[PDB]
Amino acid sequence: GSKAVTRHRRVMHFQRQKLMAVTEYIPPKPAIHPSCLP
Amino acid sequence: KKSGGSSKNLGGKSSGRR
Amino acid sequence: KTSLSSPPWPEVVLPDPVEETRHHAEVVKKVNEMIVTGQYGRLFAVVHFAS
Amino acid sequence: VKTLLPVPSFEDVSIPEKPKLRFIERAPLVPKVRREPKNLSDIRGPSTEATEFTEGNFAILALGGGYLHWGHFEMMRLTINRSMDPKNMFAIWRVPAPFKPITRKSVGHRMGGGKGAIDHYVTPVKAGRLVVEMGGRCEFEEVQGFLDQVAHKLPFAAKAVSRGTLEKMRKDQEERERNNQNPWTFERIATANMLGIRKVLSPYDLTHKGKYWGKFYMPKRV
Amino acid sequence: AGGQWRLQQGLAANPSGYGPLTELPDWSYADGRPAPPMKGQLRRKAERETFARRVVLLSQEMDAGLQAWQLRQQKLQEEQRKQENALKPKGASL
Amino acid sequence: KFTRSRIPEKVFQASPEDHEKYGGDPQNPHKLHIVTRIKSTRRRPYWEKDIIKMLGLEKAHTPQVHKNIPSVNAKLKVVKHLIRIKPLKLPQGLPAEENMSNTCLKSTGELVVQWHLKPVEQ
Amino acid sequence: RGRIPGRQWIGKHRRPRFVSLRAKQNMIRRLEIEAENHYWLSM
RNA sequence: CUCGAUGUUGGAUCAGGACAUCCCGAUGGUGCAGCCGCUAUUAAAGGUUCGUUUGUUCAACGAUUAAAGUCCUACGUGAUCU
RNA sequence: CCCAUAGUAGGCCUAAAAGCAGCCACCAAUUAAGAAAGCGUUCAAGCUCAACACCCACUACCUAAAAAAUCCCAAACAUAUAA
Ligand code: FES
Ligand SMILES: [K+]
Ligand SMILES: [K+]
Ligand SMILES: [K+]
Ligand SMILES: [K+]
Ligand SMILES: [Mg+2]
Ligand SMILES: [Mg+2]
Ligand SMILES: [Mg+2]
Ligand SMILES: [Mg+2]
Ligand SMILES: [Mg+2]
Ligand SMILES: [Mg+2]
Ligand SMILES: [Mg+2]
Ligand SMILES: [Mg+2]
Ligand SMILES: [Mg+2]
Ligand SMILES: [Mg+2]
Ligand SMILES: [Mg+2]
Ligand SMILES: [Mg+2]
Ligand SMILES: [Mg+2]
Ligand SMILES: [Mg+2]
Ligand SMILES: [Mg+2]
Ligand SMILES: [Mg+2]
Ligand SMILES: [Mg+2]
Ligand SMILES: [Mg+2]
């Protein structure tokens, strides 16, 4: 097996991959784009 | 086939005292 | 009016519930009379039996 | 009527007597005899030392973990000293000299036969550490170019920063976490062992919180 | 299909669960006499009886526990008072 | 190393917003949980396998009633990721000896004491 | 062409696995159940 | 993986394939005047010698050639040979 | 985009140093133009930039590839109400 610190980006366990996907930053989206208002 | 070296650290085989 | 201004599906307008309640009673009465007058031949049924 | 604005003044600023970066030795003056374990945790996770500005206003900020050998120090010194203005600029090292011994086995030998002899020394660096700090009677625009050139040549992700840009970086990350609209965050799930997730996570992830993977730092992770 | 919808109406997610479709007798004698109860329905009836009885046992045990602790606290408070009484002080205060 | 997980106590402190979302009353806590296993114990540490047995949750999708007390909750927290916890609701009160045999546990968590299998005349 | 060295899902070089939309929804669905479990264990 | 056997160098024979092009084709740049070169892009249809010594692969040398390319194919190929 | 005169080749050192090898100063003419930011000249010339005038450029200020050997490799599809 490979050590916890590697030169390459180590592949993640699939469950961890899913965790990352589900916890991504979602920015606050305004109802009306601010450029479309006075 | 290259001829290798040996470890210079002996001893250190004591078991746990419990 | 553009290709995406409105949804692709057509607009559906359902009947007025009051008017439809009267239409439903007429349909039920018509089918009921067919039973009373025996205007049916062979019948089939879907029965739940043994799971 | 093009509108001029007041130019910043550096009258109070004072340039040290030795402005240029000093020479960094390949190995410590007294050679280390005891061979040490690999200890890869020394480049893992957030840095706790040399994270803040001291004397200068500009620096190179580490965005990953890595080891700096003597070759890197020479690149940094020669590039910065050649490019800097000694009269108006000064540079200091924010990293110690190579001190961690790296062993190597002789070429062609099999596995076993004891640990290898010490070959060279390295300086461990963690993400978030200032590597070189510059100051003097100059603006960030003046030093950003050659500082960015040096940062690109480092064995880890790095970027030239200033007191202003560094603080804005931190404020932006705090704002993203506060205004994040995702109800689920790595910290909440991991610390509560939701889904039994800790069976695929390291104990370090309770404090890394999904921002660090091996030696790599993910700045866009909240 | 429809499991989530059934749950929203207070029904079992699976239509094979509780309800008239499953529990009602499958058949009866043509004359009118009812059929002996189905074996699966008898098992379900017994299963539900044990669950209800456990619900009553767990509840009663929890009530008795709360009443026992409430009686222990009441006694403890009463005991403190009795210890206060003693002989009358004398000396400088008299 | 993978070990048992200590859950911070703050995880089990409900906020006012939580009470609105789920509809529980902090001043009138429910007496009994309805607990159902919804996740296998395969590929889980042995200590989690053993608690599932202790709680009578060996068979999945089979509701079990348990007392809502600290000791029981301590076990439930170890296996919280394997189960669904809902409060037992008693809209017509506790079953009596007369209606012991006519109870049904609905999917809403309400234990009804009459089960007629008839439509509502209302 | 396009071989994965050694065995597909082990070792240093692996076949990349991607997270589908429904895989995400499955995980979120169970996160909601556990979040509610937290609540009912608080009283 | 194979030791109840997957015959082990170089050569002969026949070659299949890659292009990171030795020659031939088409282009950009040049410290490209021209003649010769250097470097890069594109091109794998076709082609890519004979000898002295050495078992040699290589290497040296002689005489040539538009050029005497780099590699993979169980260091291609012994139920085809040596 | 547009446009550039002048104390003056500031002194110093230097065979020569004229904004632009080095050292010191970095003041001033014209409404406006650094004792000069980048090229260039043996030294000069010569071409730009920061100026004025003109006047809505009404700038993004996050980066960025690919090559192997028998023959690519499911077929396909941006549009009908989350199941
Ligand atoms: S779409 Fe509203 S300002 Fe352009
Ligand atoms: K780098
Ligand atoms: K592999
Ligand atoms: K063998
Ligand atoms: K000069
Ligand atoms: Mg092994
Ligand atoms: Mg390991
Ligand atoms: Mg010991
Ligand atoms: Mg021992
Ligand atoms: Mg394989
Ligand atoms: Mg055999
Ligand atoms: Mg061929
Ligand atoms: Mg090519
Ligand atoms: Mg061979
Ligand atoms: Mg033979
Ligand atoms: Mg053969
Ligand atoms: Mg002048
Ligand atoms: Mg002069
Ligand atoms: Mg001068
Ligand atoms: Mg000059
Ligand atoms: Mg002026
Ligand atoms: Mg001039
Ligand atoms: Mg100009």
The domain containing residue E19 runs over which residues? Answer: 2-86
Q: Which of G9, G19, G25 to mutate to test the interface with A (most CBs of A within 10 A)?
A: G19
3-state SS assignment for residue D119 = strand
DSSP label at residue D217 = E
Q: Which of C9, C5, C25 is nearest to C17 (CA)?
A: C25
What is Dmax (Cα atoms) for chain G?
60
Solved with: cryo-EM
Round to whole Å and give the CA distance between D38 and D50.
23
CA separation for the pair D133, D131 (Å, rounded): 7
The residue whose two tokens read 């607009």 is: C11
- Rounded to whole angstroms, how far apart are CA atoms E10 and E22? 16
F12: tokens are 């089990």
As beta bridge partners, residue F89 has: F110
Q: Which residue(s) pair with E51 in the sheet? A: none
Cβ contacts (< 8 Å) between F33 and chain G: which residues? 40
Gap between the terminal Cα atoms of chain D = 46
- Count of structural domains within chain E: 1
With CA atoms as reference, report the closest residue to A25 among D184, D182, G28, D186: D182
Distance A38 CA to ligand 1 centre (A): 11
The values of phi and psi at residue E16, to 5°, are -75, -5
Amino acid residing at D147 = L
How many angstroms separate the CA atoms of D118 and D103, rounded?
4
- In whole angstroms, give the CA distance from residue E90 to residue C48: 95
Is residue F107 less than 8 Å (CB to CB) from chain D?
no
Burial status of residue D152 (CB atoms within 10 A of its CB: 0-12, 13-18, 19 or more) = exposed
Name the helix (H) or strand (E) containing G38: helix G21-40
Instruction: Please name which of F45, F50, C7, C29 lies closest in space to residue D193, comparing C-alpha atoms.
Output: F45
Please state, in angstroms and rounded to a whole number, the distance separating the CA atoms of residues C26 and E41. 41
Q: Is the CB of G17 under 7 A from strand I?
A: no
Nearest to F14 among G30, G34, G42 (CB): G42
Report resolution in angstroms: 2.6
Residue whose tokens read 């990293």: D95
Count CB atoms within 10 A of the CB of residue D194: 23
Quote the strand ranges of G1-43, DSSP E. none
The answer to whether G29 CB is within 7 Å of strand I is no
Rounded Cα gap, residues F40 and D136, in angstroms: 65
Neighbours of chain C (3+ CB pairs under 8 A): E
Closest CA relative to residue D41, chosen from D65, D61, D70, D62: D65
- E73, part of any domain: yes
> Rounded to whole angstroms, what are the CA distances from D73 to D1, F15, F51, F60?
49, 53, 57, 62
d(CA E48, CA F104): 7
Sequence-distant contacts of G3-6: CB under 8 A, at least 24 apart: none
E91 in any annotated domain: no
The secondary structure of residue D138, as a DSSP letter, is -
Q: In sequence order, which residues have a C-beta less than 8 Å from that of residue D192 and are 6 or more positions away?
A: F7, F8, F11, G38
The C-alpha atoms of residue F34 and residue F65 are separated, in whole angstroms, by 5
How far in angstroms lies nucleotide I41's C1' from the CA of residue D86? 29
DSSP one-letter code for E28: B
Closest CA to D129 of D203, D69, D42, D210: D42
| CA D7/CA C36 separation, integer angstroms | 103
Q: Are D59 and D160 in contact (CB under 8 A)?
A: yes
Handedness of CA D145, D147, D152, D156 (dihedral sign): negative
Question: Is residue E93 in some structural domain?
Answer: no
Q: State the Cα–Cα distance between residues D88 and D137, nearest whole angstrom.
A: 5
- Please name the residues in contact with F2: beta carbons below 8 A apart, sequence gap of 6 or more: D198, D199, F45
Nearest one of F20, F46, F33, F48 to F84, comparing CA atoms: F33
Query: D192 CB near a chain F CB, below 8 Å?
Result: yes
Residues composing chain G: 43
Helix extents (H) in D27-162:
70-83, 140-152
How far is the C-alpha of A17 from the C-alpha of G16, rounded, in Å? 11
Sequence-distant (≥ 6) Cβ neighbours of residue E7 within 8 angstroms: E13, F107
Pick from F39, F61, F53: nearest CA to F105: F61
Place of tokens 């004591």: B14
Question: Is residue E72 in a domain?
Answer: yes
